[PDB]
Subunit: 388 residues, 4 copies
Amino acid sequence: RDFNNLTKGLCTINSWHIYGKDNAVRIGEDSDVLVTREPYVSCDPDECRFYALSQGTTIRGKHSNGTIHDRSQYRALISWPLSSPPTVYNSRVECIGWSSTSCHDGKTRMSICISGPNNNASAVIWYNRRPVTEINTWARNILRTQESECVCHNGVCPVVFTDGSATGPAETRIYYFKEGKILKWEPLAGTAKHIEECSCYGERAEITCTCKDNWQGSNRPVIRIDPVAMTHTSQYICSPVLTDNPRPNDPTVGKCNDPYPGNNNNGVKGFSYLDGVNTWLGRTISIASRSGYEMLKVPNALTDDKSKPTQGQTIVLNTDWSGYSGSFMDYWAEGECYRACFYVELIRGRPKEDKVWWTSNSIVSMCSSTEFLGQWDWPDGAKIEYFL
Amino acid sequence: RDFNNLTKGLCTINSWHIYGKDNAVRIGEDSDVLVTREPYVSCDPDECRFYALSQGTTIRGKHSNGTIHDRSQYRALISWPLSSPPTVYNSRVECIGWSSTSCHDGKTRMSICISGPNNNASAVIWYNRRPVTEINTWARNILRTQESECVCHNGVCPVVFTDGSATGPAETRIYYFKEGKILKWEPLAGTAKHIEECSCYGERAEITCTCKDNWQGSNRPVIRIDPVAMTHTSQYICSPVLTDNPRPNDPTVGKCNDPYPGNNNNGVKGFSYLDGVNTWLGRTISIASRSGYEMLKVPNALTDDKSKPTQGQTIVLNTDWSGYSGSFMDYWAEGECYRACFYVELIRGRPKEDKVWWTSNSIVSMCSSTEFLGQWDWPDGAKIEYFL
Amino acid sequence: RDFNNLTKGLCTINSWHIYGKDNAVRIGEDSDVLVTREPYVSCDPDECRFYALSQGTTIRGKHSNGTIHDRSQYRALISWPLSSPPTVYNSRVECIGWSSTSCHDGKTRMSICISGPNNNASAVIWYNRRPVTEINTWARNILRTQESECVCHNGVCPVVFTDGSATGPAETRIYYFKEGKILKWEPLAGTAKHIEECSCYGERAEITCTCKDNWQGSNRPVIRIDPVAMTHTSQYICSPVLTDNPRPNDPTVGKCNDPYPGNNNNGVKGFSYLDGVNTWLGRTISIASRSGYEMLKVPNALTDDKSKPTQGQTIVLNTDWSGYSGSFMDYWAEGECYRACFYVELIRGRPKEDKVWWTSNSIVSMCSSTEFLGQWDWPDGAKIEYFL
Amino acid sequence: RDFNNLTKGLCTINSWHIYGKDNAVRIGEDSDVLVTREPYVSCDPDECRFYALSQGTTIRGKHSNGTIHDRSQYRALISWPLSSPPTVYNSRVECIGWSSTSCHDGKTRMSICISGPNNNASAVIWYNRRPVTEINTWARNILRTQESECVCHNGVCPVVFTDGSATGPAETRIYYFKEGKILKWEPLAGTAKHIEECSCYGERAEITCTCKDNWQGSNRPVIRIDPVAMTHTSQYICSPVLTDNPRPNDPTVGKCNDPYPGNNNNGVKGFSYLDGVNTWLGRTISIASRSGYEMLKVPNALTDDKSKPTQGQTIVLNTDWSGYSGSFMDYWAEGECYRACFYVELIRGRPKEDKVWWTSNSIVSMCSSTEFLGQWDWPDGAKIEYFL
Ligand SMILES: *[C@@H]1O[C@H](CO)[C@@H](O[C@@H]2O[C@H](CO)[C@@H](O[C@@H]3O[C@H](CO[C@H]4O[C@H](CO)[C@@H](O)[C@H](O)[C@@H]4O)[C@@H](O)[C@H](O[C@H]4O[C@H](CO)[C@@H](O)[C@H](O)[C@@H]4O[C@H]4O[C@H](CO)[C@@H](O)[C@H](O)[C@@H]4O[C@H]4O[C@H](CO)[C@@H](O)[C@H](O)[C@@H]4O)[C@@H]3O)[C@H](O)[C@H]2NC(C)=O)[C@H](O)[C@H]1NC(C)=O
Ligand SMILES: *[C@@H]1O[C@H](CO)[C@@H](O[C@@H]2O[C@H](CO)[C@@H](O[C@@H]3O[C@H](CO[C@H]4O[C@H](CO)[C@@H](O)[C@H](O)[C@@H]4O)[C@@H](O)[C@H](O[C@H]4O[C@H](CO)[C@@H](O)[C@H](O)[C@@H]4O[C@H]4O[C@H](CO)[C@@H](O)[C@H](O)[C@@H]4O[C@H]4O[C@H](CO)[C@@H](O)[C@H](O)[C@@H]4O)[C@@H]3O)[C@H](O)[C@H]2NC(C)=O)[C@H](O)[C@H]1NC(C)=O
Ligand SMILES: *[C@@H]1O[C@H](CO)[C@@H](O[C@@H]2O[C@H](CO)[C@@H](O[C@@H]3O[C@H](CO[C@H]4O[C@H](CO)[C@@H](O)[C@H](O)[C@@H]4O)[C@@H](O)[C@H](O[C@H]4O[C@H](CO)[C@@H](O)[C@H](O)[C@@H]4O[C@H]4O[C@H](CO)[C@@H](O)[C@H](O)[C@@H]4O[C@H]4O[C@H](CO)[C@@H](O)[C@H](O)[C@@H]4O)[C@@H]3O)[C@H](O)[C@H]2NC(C)=O)[C@H](O)[C@H]1NC(C)=O
Ligand SMILES: *[C@@H]1O[C@H](CO)[C@@H](O[C@@H]2O[C@H](CO)[C@@H](O[C@@H]3O[C@H](CO[C@H]4O[C@H](CO)[C@@H](O)[C@H](O)[C@@H]4O)[C@@H](O)[C@H](O[C@H]4O[C@H](CO)[C@@H](O)[C@H](O)[C@@H]4O[C@H]4O[C@H](CO)[C@@H](O)[C@H](O)[C@@H]4O[C@H]4O[C@H](CO)[C@@H](O)[C@H](O)[C@@H]4O)[C@@H]3O)[C@H](O)[C@H]2NC(C)=O)[C@H](O)[C@H]1NC(C)=O
Ligand SMILES: *[C@@H]1O[C@H](CO)[C@@H](O[C@@H]2O[C@H](CO)[C@@H](O)[C@H](O)[C@H]2NC(C)=O)[C@H](O)[C@H]1NC(C)=O
Ligand SMILES: *[C@@H]1O[C@H](CO)[C@@H](O[C@@H]2O[C@H](CO)[C@@H](O)[C@H](O)[C@H]2NC(C)=O)[C@H](O)[C@H]1NC(C)=O
Ligand SMILES: CC(=O)N[C@H]1[C@H]([C@H](O)[C@H](O)CO)OC(C(=O)O)=C[C@@H]1O
Ligand SMILES: CC(=O)N[C@H]1[C@H]([C@H](O)[C@H](O)CO)OC(C(=O)O)=C[C@@H]1O
Ligand SMILES: CC(=O)N[C@H]1[C@H]([C@H](O)[C@H](O)CO)OC(C(=O)O)=C[C@@H]1O
Ligand SMILES: CC(=O)N[C@H]1[C@H]([C@H](O)[C@H](O)CO)OC(C(=O)O)=C[C@@H]1O
Ligand SMILES: *[C@@H]1O[C@H](CO)[C@@H](O)[C@H](O)[C@H]1NC(C)=O
Ligand SMILES: [Ca+2]
Ligand SMILES: [Ca+2]
Ligand SMILES: [Ca+2]
Ligand SMILES: [Ca+2]
Ligand SMILES: [Ca+2]
């Protein structure tokens, strides 16, 4: 109809309720479920769907051997009905590639997939299911993007890309698309020293992205975008409650404009909702591996370098595997506020479970409630032994 | 379009004709059919579909081992086309959880799923396929609901929930929802001493629910709801034709306001159509187990404590497994009256058939006919030996 | 929109072109294809689909054992996209039962399924996918119907049913339905001595049905219906070109008003297009079994007791299995005439191929061409040995 | 809506970006994927889909044995969602046959399938999913057509057919259809000596077809059609950059009006975009087999007999199997020009990989970019050893 505008603020997050879970690995043990990773969720005005990067093979298929690798010519961004598993028969291909983002602007959807060899990748921007724009690698070192939904405002949908080193300074760019065409792009500015895999959400005409500093930071870089002025800023979440993985133990004071040190060249895609006292941070429970997952209410985390938790909710037990996590919201829901949502990628197989030769995942997702709901843990649920 | 209003009375039930049967277990022996239980049927203005609680695994899948359990993080309310089986590829997830209800109000559908640990469950009310309201457990003991469709009138859709003991007094509540929001809720009143799994239907602006007294009653509790005044009453079916399971042998006089004794802490979800002389009761044939199923015309069963059958129809032979049963009607059909319908859950596997490690079911459903039709029996049809 | 009216005459049939073929048995050797029999084709204003009676199990499934039987509680009328196979995932259940018919009246579709024990069967008439009318057995001996599409004219859709003996006089009735309700029914009149499984088509406000005399006739009975007056007549195809199976060898003179003798208590569903010189008869090539299939142009077959072929076309070689055949036309096609079409059921398995324990079929269908096209034979294509 | 008119010219081709890839063989190793060959892509105003000739069996199915053969009664033209594999459950049959073409005219789609024995084949032209016209073989020797999409202009959709010898002069005809009816047909004229499997595209009211001279030419014949005048011309691509396969090594001067000699009675379906300096030729890398694939920018290839490459892009490495290739464009895309696209059939199995008894393929397709994008190679990706 008309382009969606981020006119509402976030609903008050008093807890998280179960939104979707596909139990893909469990079901895939005996049905045609595609091997995936880097999943996310994204809504259209009339439907919300699961998204992920297929590996172009089923889990039980012999070609599942080797799927621990991130980039091949057999990957593609696929979407499928909410809470169903990604099957060969119900998965809709959005585009071909090994890194992606996607978002609906209110009229139609834009999907972006990057493909290529490490030194010669290119992104192709699809809009209304047709290819419209292409962007060649600018740093010749694994052009890559969000791995979760982008956000639009009055037709303008900003997207963060990074090209260059994962263990040193790289060239991050913010592109402002409208109907799949480039209106403008900026180099990263602000104090964030390294950016990768931004998780974004929008409220009151501002887009907030919680990303990952793979190079040096255990605290997360944050990019705030003004989609009208098409400008942005960057800093780190000040809070001592560190949210990347692996990471050192939490200090009593964090860092607002530099990566919090202790762990180099590694990390995991994550997210947060930074809204004053209505601030919630997600993170793995383990400081060493992609294990467990919890939500922590940390009032003013973005700006308070001594902020600590005032409430919390466990999503996945530390005795269960987690993985990537990101933000999305149904911008077309009823009501006066936007209900914060997120998903957690539940990785199974390699490298942690090496008795099988594949790597895949399932998805679990929650949205906020103004109630103070009881909590449950949500594991993948599959028994690896069954796949042996 | 406009909210549906219960303006018609029930059609005269002279017999029951076959409406739907999915033969899920038979078909699932060699195709990707999800393990389920607690099924039901519910109509939209343009389509009627089967519903059930998936166990998040196929029947042949190795994860089917252990599905005798009722509550896990891998269950979800799913719906699928009438008479098809619930397959991985055609099942649409309505919400995540281990207890549910769902109903269309004429404009859109409301679905409710409860999830959580036993002492910290919560219900989330979805409307127009989006989460709208959440209700935290109030008695911290397995918050649970109908396991069959709710009914709406002018946008108001009452739903019965129970939280607390299954073997002693519990806290039952009647919630009146409109567009997924809570208009009001009441504590259970009347003479019903324990309520669980209500099967409801509506006619002439009144909603009748036949539930189950798990604690003490072998006769069924009945809740009658006025969806305009948003008030209700409760009592038991007076009739000596006892309809819970297990149960003692039929007496010559029943009980109108107390549970009929003889069997404690057990029962099965069931239903009835209480409409004066046009009254029909469903029940298992066996008084000891979920075996067989029959419909008995018992004029004035609700109010006559000596009422006995005047007609009957066998649905499932006592030599075949049955299970839960419930009511639904197509409120959007043509004609001057509402055609009473019901389904019977045909449970296969554990605990009765323990040579397999799973528990699932198939569905059979009938609707009334003004004709006096010949009868057939409708078993699940699968051979357990094939699964060994 | 508006009810369809049979305003056109038949197109001139100069040959037959390939219309659809699902290769169900071939494909079903390694995919989830349902076991079926008694198939047919029927069109809606916007789509034409394959129909058949499922056996409630896949071909490879262990429950395929025993599918040679005609009536069980696991059968149902299903439809699926033209030329696809009937799979668990794409088959839409129209109704439950073991004998059926279905037709679109221009506004919506009417489907009829009969179920029950032999002595207590009943038909339920669905319209706009909802049950509307029920008819109890009148002779208590396998109430049964067409097994191919019915035809409508201005909302009136006549259907032929038979109840009673298959080897002696039975009670055949012609029901005239409108919106699933009974307007009127007649007992069979005319000279046809026994009627079963009528194949019908309509042109210029008249409905012609070529049926089968199971009791005594090797020539086919024909019922011509006036859907406005709601009256009919019956006789036999006069032609010496005999079209039932099994049958004796062709004589030089046929019978117009009595069954042509030589074979009792047996037969196969078949069809014909009786249109003066534009008359074509279908039949198995073998006089002993459901083997092979050919179309023969026999000018004035209905009324000329010495009529013999003037042209022909082989559909299935005598070295391949055939089965039932019936008529259908796309009444919503463009042009000035109705294009005659038919299907042939290609039966595989029992009783002819007893190395497997199942019985199923695939479908092949053709429509007429005003051209004189070259001919090909169209076998099922599956190798039974593969199923061993 | 209205018939589409070829009002735009081609976009400038500076490189090729990835458009679609189904990884069918990889996925089909463990899911119900149909065996195919002769694939292509074609767009409707609201969707673009993959097309191919099914072999009526899955790859893992026992009936895959023997699929190296081109013509059987079990083949059919099927289409399925872009980049999904052709599965039993998602493939839509367009028509029955072993040679095809299909194109949308802006209002609806026309599909053509040819079937029959070698000496008695016939084509049936479907429009709006209904059979409308039939054409009997005129030379009684494998009537055959494009194997890729046709193109329409103001309702007129020309199609090239060939009937007769593959190793000597044959009878090629250009049919001009409108709404599935024949407006006119011409015999081939011009200097092309033999025509088969034309790959066509349209721009500025002209339709260009790059075909194959199986008899004698290693350069490709080209037919240019005026769809308004319903006339055409024919010649060969003048360029010394030879594009058929097998072929001799490239000379320094080609042939404009005769086949370039060196290889007889063989070839592969291919294509090109002939647009002055914006000219690109596709071809296998190997001169001996269907191995590898590359795009070469050869300015004025059609008319310059000494034209050589000025730019290039590898699509498939010479160490990977290729096959047929053809042209298509989304005529309903936004913008001022038509974006050239093509697909490459990636053949697996026989005859090159004879350890398996089947022959199938997967699809990869690209479209042009005005950017100078980095290149990647796109192999089928399946491991034959897994199928052993
Ligand atoms: C039914 O459901 C309800 C609803 O969920 C249940 O109630 C919930 O119960 C939760 C568990 O108790 C509770 O969650 C905790 O909340 C704490 C905040 O509340 C408390 O403090 C505030 C502020 O003073 C008070 O107002 C309030 O009254 C409470 O006293 C959080 O602090 C908790 O998180 C910390 O603990 C968990 C372990 O439980 C860690 O995983 C987590 O990371 C936090 O601790 C780490 O991080 C902090 C900050 O840096 C460190 O200081 C601390 O030492 C820990 O650091 C180590 O561990 C991390 C992580 O591994 C590592 O990185 C670091 O290096 C160190 O090694 C927790 O979030 C809910 O808020 C509460 N909800 C409600 C509405 O009540 C109820 O129990 C259920 N009923 C039953 C019967 O089960
Ligand atoms: C073709 O199709 C037609 C249509 O279906 C067939 O006709 C039907 O035939 C049915 C079977 O006969 C018949 O069903 C029965 O109807 C009885 C009521 O009718 C009779 O009584 C009335 C009232 O006086 C008369 O007007 C009428 O003319 C008849 O005489 C019911 O009473 C029957 O139910 C009882 O019996 C069955 C066993 O058959 C039990 O399963 C059932 O539970 C009922 O009996 C138990 O319960 C009562 C009440 O408390 C007890 O008194 C009794 O002792 C039994 O109790 C024990 O068993 C229960 C259950 O296990 C247990 O809980 C308890 O503790 C005890 O242990 C039955 O419903 C249809 O009405 C009839 N329909 C029509 C339209 O005619 C026709 O036969 C078919 N043709 C062929 C050729 O097959
Ligand atoms: C390319 O394609 C074209 C198009 O299809 C091919 O041309 C077609 O060729 C067909 C085969 O020749 C031909 O079909 C036959 O047509 C005959 C009618 O035409 C002839 O007679 C007329 C009338 O005088 C002439 O005008 C005309 O010019 C011809 O001379 C039919 O009579 C044929 O059917 C009979 O034979 C077949 C066996 O071929 C039987 O299966 C069939 O049942 C018919 O014969 C039985 O029945 C009759 C009637 O009672 C009996 O008299 C006879 O003895 C047989 O009876 C026995 O068998 C039956 C069946 O088993 C059994 O029940 C009975 O008891 C007995 O045991 C046949 O239909 C097409 O018309 C023709 N089409 C065109 C447009 O030309 C061309 O060949 C192809 N090219 C190549 C290179 O292959
Ligand atoms: C990142 O991505 C970018 C973008 O893709 C990469 O840059 C691309 O690099 C490509 C590879 O170098 C390049 O492709 C070549 O382009 C040549 C044309 O450009 C050159 O000449 C022009 C004209 O003078 C200059 O303007 C220009 O500056 C260049 O100097 C083509 O000529 C190339 O094709 C020929 O070579 C390949 C092998 O590489 C053959 O497969 C191909 O068939 C061509 O050669 C055969 O055919 C010709 C013509 O008849 C014969 O003369 C020749 O001898 C060969 O013949 C044999 O082989 C054929 C085929 O088997 C057989 O039939 C025959 O009988 C003989 O046996 C090639 O197309 C892209 O244009 C370039 N793109 C851009 C925008 O720059 C970049 O490298 C990537 N980065 C990294 C780090 O990898
Ligand atoms: C059910 O009853 C309500 C009246 O209570 C109907 O509601 C009215 O509908 C019309 C048409 O939309 C409006 O003009 C009225 O204001 C509506 N509501 C009320 C609450 O007054 C409703 O249309 C009825 N449903 C149907 C299917 O007729
Ligand atoms: C089939 O014939 C009937 C006439 O018998 C047509 O019915 C009339 O349709 C128009 C338009 O809906 C109405 O105004 C008349 O009252 C209708 N019916 C009768 C019974 O008079 C019908 O439209 C015809 N079908 C088509 C497709 O033209
Ligand atoms: C484009 C790409 O390769 N992204 C990969 C990403 C990347 O390697 C890291 O961000 C350092 O740049 O790492 C991971 C990961 O699970 O850790 C998965 C992604 O597939
Ligand atoms: C929420 C829940 O657990 N419901 C379970 C219900 C419950 O245990 C009983 O009603 C006593 O409360 O019992 C049964 C049952 O087949 O008997 C199945 C349900 O899954
Ligand atoms: C309702 C029913 O049973 N129809 C059966 C029919 C019937 O037995 C015969 O018409 C004598 O009445 O026979 C056959 C058959 O392949 O021969 C199949 C049908 O399933
Ligand atoms: C109608 C038909 O058979 N076409 C076949 C075609 C043909 O044989 C050749 O064009 C000589 O005429 O060859 C090939 C091929 O892979 O080479 C595949 C096609 O299936
Ligand atoms: C099929 O059923 C028959 C009859 O019960 C049995 O003897 C036979 O062995 C079965 N065959 C198979 C393969 O199950
Ligand atoms: Ca880091
Ligand atoms: Ca399978
Ligand atoms: Ca009880
Ligand atoms: Ca007979
Ligand atoms: Ca050649």
